[PDB]
Amino acid sequence: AEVISVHSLEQWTMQIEEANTAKKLVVIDFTASWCGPCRIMAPVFADLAKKFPNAVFLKVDVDELKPIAEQFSVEAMPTFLFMKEGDVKDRVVGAIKEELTAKVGLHAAAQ
């Protein structure tokens, strides 16, 4: 299991429909290349994706896929968004490593 970098609206679509069919948790890192705390959270996110291979970990650049950042009103980065079967379960705003880790544990958990 790896972080998928979601570059196009098509990859977004595929990744979301497939996870929803499988009823998997989706964790999304809304990120920006210029964003210091974003670069810093990259390896943390990557490590959680390895540790929870039954959740789908997505990365979305807020500058590249504006409509996706916008539908979730993401104007602070990094923002970690937790979603399952269409519902937003949770969010972490900023490089808060323990808060990200805890909510992945809680939401990936044998529900």
* Distance of alpha carbon 111 from alpha carbon 108, whole angstroms: 7
* Distance of alpha carbon 78 from alpha carbon 73, whole angstroms: 13
Residue-by-residue DSSP string for 29-93: EEE-TT-HHHHHHHHHHHHHHHH-TTSEEEEEETTT-HHHHHHTT--SSSEEEEEETTEEEEEEE
Technique used by the depositors: X-ray
* Residue 28, phi then psi, degrees to nearest 5: -120, 130
Q: Which amino acid is at 29?
A: D
Looking up tokens 């805890």 gives 102
* Distance of alpha carbon 36 from alpha carbon 31, whole angstroms: 10
Instruction: Determine which one of 27, 28, 35, 83 is catalytic.
Output: 35
Q: Is the dihedral of CA 66, 35, 28, 95 positive or negative?
A: negative
Q: Which helix (H) or strand (E) holds 19?
A: helix 9-21
Q: Which amino acid is at 3?
A: V
Query: What tokens appear for 95 in the block?
Result: 């490089």
Query: What tokens appear for 12 in the block?
Result: 């977004």
Active site residue 35: yes
Instruction: Determine which one of 6, 27, 38, 81 is catalytic.
Output: 38
Q: What is the resolution of this structure in A?
A: 2.0
Instruction: Give me the domains of the chain, ranges plus CATH numbers.
Output: 3-111 (3.40.30.10)
